[PDB]
Amino acid sequence: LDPGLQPGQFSADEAGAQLFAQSYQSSAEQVLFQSVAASWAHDTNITAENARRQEEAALLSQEFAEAWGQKAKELYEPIWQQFTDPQLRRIIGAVRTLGSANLPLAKRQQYNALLSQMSRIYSTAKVCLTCWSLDPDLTNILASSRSYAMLLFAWEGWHNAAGIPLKPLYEDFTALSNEAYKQDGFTDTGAYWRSWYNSPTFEDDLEHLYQQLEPLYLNLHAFVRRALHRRYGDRYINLRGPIPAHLLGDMWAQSWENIYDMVVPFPDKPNLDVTSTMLQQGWQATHMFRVAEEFFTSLELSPMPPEFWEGSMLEKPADGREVVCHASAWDFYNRKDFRIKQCTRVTMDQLSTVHHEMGHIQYYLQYKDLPVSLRRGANPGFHEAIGDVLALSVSTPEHLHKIGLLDRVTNDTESDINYLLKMALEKIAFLPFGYLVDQWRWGVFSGRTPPSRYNFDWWYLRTKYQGICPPVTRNETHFDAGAKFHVPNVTPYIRYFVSFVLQFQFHEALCKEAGYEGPLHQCDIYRSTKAGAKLRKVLRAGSSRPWQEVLKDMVGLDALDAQPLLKYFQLVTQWLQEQNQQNGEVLGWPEYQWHPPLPDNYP
Ligand SMILES: *[C@@H]1O[C@H](CO[C@@H]2O[C@@H](C)[C@@H](O)[C@@H](O)[C@@H]2O)[C@@H](O[C@@H]2O[C@H](CO)[C@@H](O[C@@H]3O[C@H](CO)[C@@H](O)[C@H](O)[C@@H]3O)[C@H](O)[C@H]2NC(C)=O)[C@H](O)[C@H]1NC(C)=O
Ligand SMILES: *[C@@H]1O[C@H](CO)[C@@H](O[C@@H]2O[C@H](CO)[C@@H](O)[C@H](O)[C@H]2NC(C)=O)[C@H](O)[C@H]1NC(C)=O
Ligand SMILES: *[C@@H]1O[C@H](CO[C@@H]2O[C@@H](C)[C@@H](O)[C@@H](O)[C@@H]2O)[C@@H](O)[C@H](O)[C@H]1NC(C)=O
Ligand SMILES: [Cl-]
Ligand SMILES: [Zn+2]
């Protein structure tokens, strides 16, 4: 480690730790900058040379972590917990967590290499027969093909190409991750991930939330299953069984907005998917980013700086290079450079994704003056929810009309049902998947799920919560969990279930604060400077204070709460129950063993 980057001496006491943290921050900024730079160069341009570089950068960050980790222990182990300065306790708490820096050098190299290799496999896998990539090729197939056979070919090819080669790597990564975190005193990596919520009853709190949400999901599911039965017929849809996993519009069946045209109850009303209008008008990526920016400035939040426009990657490259297409937002830790990398396509759900990623940027802009350790969300769920909250105003029919995407606007109960059903396909359908992914991964890290049951345990959970089934037989050579971005890219998942709850609590608070006084689902906070100010107080806090207190100041409660999401959806909740009753549906999937047959000509 460079001499300039190494820790000095400080006293064993709180005045020293202040000097320590100032010294640390001053060093960490440079280390973070070089890591993030090398990751960027790789993620926008996957080459062996770029992976080697990113690995050398992660090694540097491990030596940094070890030297300051060990120094923070050596001087402050007995005293840090008792500091007067609350922010200074969280700073030291972060600095003393070693992670992968607990590994000896040889295993640090093996760990850094596994991260590179898993990311490469996921982002460069192809389905051939002349080869399709996930984004945009397979995405487009899953979204707009209605051919059982075609959709099967894409689903199977993807799962096979991405998952099978990842399995041995995934195994070796799990063992090394556990070895690293167990020397920080956690039972396993999953215990370390969970500890970010600082909540003794987290697992029980999530389960209580899920029990209140499950009836809405079960009713959406049955109604959608019926729509599918009418197109695909009795051979491929079982009205008492799980839904084939390839028929819901999306490679992971995790949100259903693309099959809106099959389920829309009142087709004579304004057409609420505005994608075709966007195309007709000639919208491009950069217009989408500008319209999103304008919503933020209407709240008196910050514009995107020059460095964001000059540095970002807003389309998939044409020049041949290979890239990580899954979207992400980048803080370089120098308080100057911030970027988005997104393979943006011109579609309405992609306009939402634009807002999602710009919400992360806005968080980085607001907290850029805190000590580097506090430059995070109050919890991870808060960071994921910011952009989603604004996207809830943007997609209201009235807002779409203001921005030239919807010609007529109607205010009547049929238009409301359409609206709430479209939003349910996006928000309600997701809930079971958002909850299950880390139940799977926590079982793997704890050893409850060894490599010999990775796929068995994955499909148990897929069926149990989502009520889907794989459309072809799977076995333990398949590794279907690894065909989802966040698994090989090692991004925790429970943050999204938390986010999907929190965003409705935020929405309700900012609508009240804006002075809005009609139905929660018709609220648009656009141009409300009072709403902007309340949002800004959250963003400016970073992780400097407990999330339960940040939440209470914002919404008036110190806990996650399903009530706002339930109030938003109330009208469609009631309507879907009534429809399913009148149609004699069976809620749930009692025929749990059922799978569809192969088509005659497969493949
Ligand atoms: C779309 O329409 C709804 C429904 O509006 C009501 O019903 C219609 C059949 C007609 O009778 C309307 O003339 C009538 O308002 C609109 O929601 C309603 O908005 C008003 C405010 O604009 C709400 O009234 C307020 O009530 C609070 C206390 O709750 C008072 O302090 C205020 O002074 C104010 O009068 C009314 O409750 C609300 N109805 C609800 C909640 O269902 C809706 O705003 C409109 N949407 C759009 C986008 O225009
Ligand atoms: C993608 O990454 C490679 C490095 O892996 C970049 O290639 C280097 O390009 C510079 C300038 O053209 C040369 O001096 C080097 O010799 C190249 N290295 C090689 C080929 O090993 C490439 O330019 C990157 N593409 C971008 C940034 O668009
Ligand atoms: C696992 O499955 C592999 C791929 O074949 C698939 O499984 C058969 C049984 C069909 O029903 C269909 O889904 C696919 O063709 C096999 O090649 C492999 O041998 C299977 N078993 C093991 C232990 O890997
Ligand atoms: Cl998380
Ligand atoms: Zn995100």
Strands 243-244 and 131-132: unpaired
Q: How far apart are CA 405 and CA 274, in angstroms?
A: 6
Residue nearest to atom 2 of ligand 2 (CA): 45
> Do 164 and 477 touch, CB atoms closer than 8 A?
yes
Burial of 3 (0-12, 13-18, 19+ CB in 10 A): exposed
CA 438 to CA 459: how far, in whole Å? 14
In whole angstroms, give the CA distance from residue 288 to residue 292. Answer: 6
User: At 150, which amino acid appears?
Assistant: M
Q: Whole-angstrom Cα distance, residue 164 to residue 488?
A: 12
The region, left, alpha or beta by phi > 0 then psi within -120 to 50, assigned to residue 104 is beta
Residue that has been written with the tokens 């090694």 in this structure? 59
Is 229 marked as a binding-site residue? no
Q: Does domain 202-582 have CATH number 2.40.50.140?
A: no
Q: How far is CA 448 from CA 167, 203, 263, 438, in A?
A: 17, 16, 39, 13
User: Is the CB–ligand 1 distance for residue 398 below 6 Å?
Assistant: yes
495 known member of a binding site: yes
Domain ranges in the chain are 1-96, 202-582
φ and ψ of 118, to 5 deg? -65, -40
Place of tokens 């003393």: 96
CA atoms of 166 and 514, how far apart (whole Å): 48
Residues 6+ apart with CB under 8 A from 159: 478, 480, 483
- What are the residues whose beta carbons fall under 8 Å from the beta carbon of 341, sequence distance 6 or more? 40, 43, 44, 312, 313, 323, 324, 327, 328, 330
- Identify which of 338, 594, 401, 377 has the alpha carbon closest to the alpha carbon of residue 499: 377
Q: How far apart are CA 98 and CA 425, in angstroms?
A: 41
- Give the residue carrying structure tokens 């389309």: 315
Which sign, positive or negative, has the C-alpha torsion 318, 324, 326, 332? negative
**From the CB of 298, is ligand 1 less than 6 Å away?**
no
Distance CA 88, CA 20 (A): 10
Q: Which residues make up the environment of ion ligand 5, defined by Cβ < 5 Å? A: 384
- Nearest CA to 432 out of 237, 596, 248 is that of 248
Q: What is the dihedral of CA 14, 19, 24, 30, to 10 degrees?
A: 160
The Å distance, Cα 381 to ligand 4 centre, comes to 7
The token pair at 108 is 């640090």
* Burial (CB count within 10 angstroms: exposed 0-12, middle 13-18, buried 19+), residue 411: exposed
CB 504, CB 277: distance < 8 Å: no
Q: Two tokens at 241?
A: 């069984």
In whole angstroms, what is the distance from residue 339 CA to residue 532 CA? 22
Ligand nearest to the CA of 518: 1
At 303, list the tokens: 């514009």
Both tokens of 220, joined, read 């959406």
Structure tokens at 567: 């109030």
Neighbouring residues of 86: CB distance < 8 A, sequence distance ≥ 6: 545
- Determine the Cα–Cα distance for residues 251 and 483; give it in Å rounded to an integer: 9
Short-list 2, 26, 8, 182, CA closest to 91: 26
Residue 88 and residue 545 in contact, taking contact as beta carbons nearer than 8 Å: no
- Coarse DSSP helix, strand, coil percentages of the chain, rounded to the nearest 5 percent: 65, 5, 35
Cα Rg for the chain, rounded, in angstroms? 24
Q: Which residues are near ligand 3 (CB < 6 Å)?
A: 472-473, 475, 477
Distance 516 CA to ligand 1 centre (A): 10
Q: Does the beta carbon of 50 lie inside 6 Å of ligand 2?
A: yes
How is residue 69 written in tokens? 């980790």
Are 509 and 485 contacting, i.e. CB atoms less than 8 angstroms apart? no
**From CA 136, how far away is CA 347, in angstroms rounded?**
12
Residues 6+ apart with CB under 8 A from 445: 174, 177, 178, 188, 189, 190, 191
Q: What are phi and psi of 350, to 5 degrees?
A: -70, -35
Q: Where are the beta strands (DSSP E) in 399-522?
A: 468-469
The one-letter code for the residue type at 219 is: N
Locus of tokens 């999907």 = 500
Q: Which of 91, 271, 110, 88 is nearest to 179 (CA)?
A: 110
Cα gap 558→547, rounded to integer Å: 8
Q: Is the peptide bond before 596 cis (omega within 30 degrees of 0)?
A: no
The string over 24-37, giving b where at least 16 C-beta atoms fall within 10 Å of a residue's C-beta and e elsewhere, is bbebbebbbbbbbb
CB distance 517 to ligand 2 below 6 Å: no
Rounded to an integer, what distance in angstroms lies between the CA atom of residue 237 and that of residue 256? 17
Of all ligands present, the nearest one to the C-alpha of 516 is 1
How far from 162 is each of 120, 125, 276, 383, CA to CA, in Å? 10, 6, 31, 28
User: What is the rounded CA–CA span in Å between residue 437 and residue 515?
Assistant: 38
Provide CB contacts within 8 A for 144, sequence distance 6+: 258
Catalytic residues: 357, 486
Output b/e per residue, 150-163; b: 16+ Cβ within 10 A: ebbbbbbbbbbbbb
Collapse the DSSP code of 236 into the 3-class scheme (helix H, G, I; strand E, B; otherwise coil) and give the result. Answer: coil
514's tokens: 């804006």
Residue nearest to atom 18 of ligand 3 (CA): 477
Residues after which the chain has a gap (C–N > 2.5 Å): 129
Residue 595 is labelled as binding a ligand: no
Measured in whole angstroms, how far is the alpha carbon of residue 207 from the centre of its chain? Answer: 20
In eight-state DSSP terms, residue 378 is S
* Alpha-helical regions (H) of 259-379: 260-263, 275-281, 285-298, 306-311, 348-367
Whether ligand 2 lies within 6 angstroms of the CB of 310 is answered as no
SS (H, E, C) 31-82: HHHHHHHHHHHHHCCCCHHHHHHHHHHHHHHHHHHHHHHHHHHHHHCCCHHH
Can you say whether residue 284 is alpha, beta or left, with left for phi > 0 and alpha for psi between -120 and 50 degrees? beta
Q: How far apart are CA 415 and CA 563, in angstroms?
A: 23
Q: Whose CA is nearest to atom 25 of ligand 2?
A: 45
Measure 490 CA to ligand 3 centroid, in angstroms. Answer: 28
578-585, Cβ contacts within 8 angstroms, sequence gap of 24 or more:
579/223, 580/219, 580/222, 580/223, 583/226, 585/222, 585/223, 585/225, 585/226, 585/239
Roughly what angle, to the nearest 10 degrees, separates helices 563-582 and 494-513? Answer: 110
* Nearest-angstrom CA–CA distance, 38 and 54: 5
At 564, list the tokens: 């706002």
Beta bridge pairs of residue 128: 131
The annotation status of 355 as a binding-site residue, yes or no, is: no
What residues does 338 pair with on adjacent strands?
331
Counting ligands in written order, the one closest to the CA of 197 is: 4
- Whether the Cβ atoms of residue 558 and residue 566 lie closer than 8 Å to each other: no
Between CA 26 and CA 35, with CA 30 as vertex, the angle to 5 degrees is 140
Ligand 2 in contact with 177 (CB < 6 A)?
A: no
170, two tokens = 């995934």
Residue bearing tokens 């943007």:
394
Q: What resolution does the deposited structure have, in angstroms?
A: 1.9
Ligand that comes closest to the CA of residue 442:
4
**Does residue 352 contact residue 380 with C-beta atoms inside 8 Å?**
no
Nearest residue to 536 via CA among 359, 306, 356: 359
For residue 380, whether the previous peptide bond is cis, meaning omega lies within 30 degrees of 0, is no
Structural determination approach: X-ray
C-beta neighbour count of 223 within 10 angstroms: 22
Task: Give pairs for 347-353: CB < 8 Å, separation 24+.
Answer: 347/275, 347/278, 348/273, 348/274, 348/275, 348/278, 348/395, 349/257, 349/258, 349/426, 350/288, 351/278, 351/288, 351/291, 351/292, 351/391, 351/394, 352/388, 352/391, 352/394, 352/395, 352/426, 353/327
**Any atom of ligand 1 within 6 Å of the Cβ of 198:** no
Is 326 marked as a binding-site residue?
no
Token pair belonging to 317: 């490259």
Bridge partners of 127, per DSSP, are 132
**Whether the Cβ atoms of residue 199 and residue 188 lie closer than 8 Å to each other:** no
Count of Cβ atoms closer than 10 Å to residue 447 Cβ: 11
* Measured distance CA(187)–CA(479) in Å, rounded: 25
Residues in the chain: 603
Provide the 3-class DSSP secondary structure of residue 7: coil
Contact 503, 391 (CB under 8 A): no
Task: Find the largest Cα–Cα distance for the chain.
Answer: 77
Q: Name residue, tokens 């000095």.
A: 8
Q: Is the CB of 328 under 6 A from ligand 2?
A: no
Alpha helices in 183-284 (DSSP H): 189-195, 202-232, 260-263, 275-281
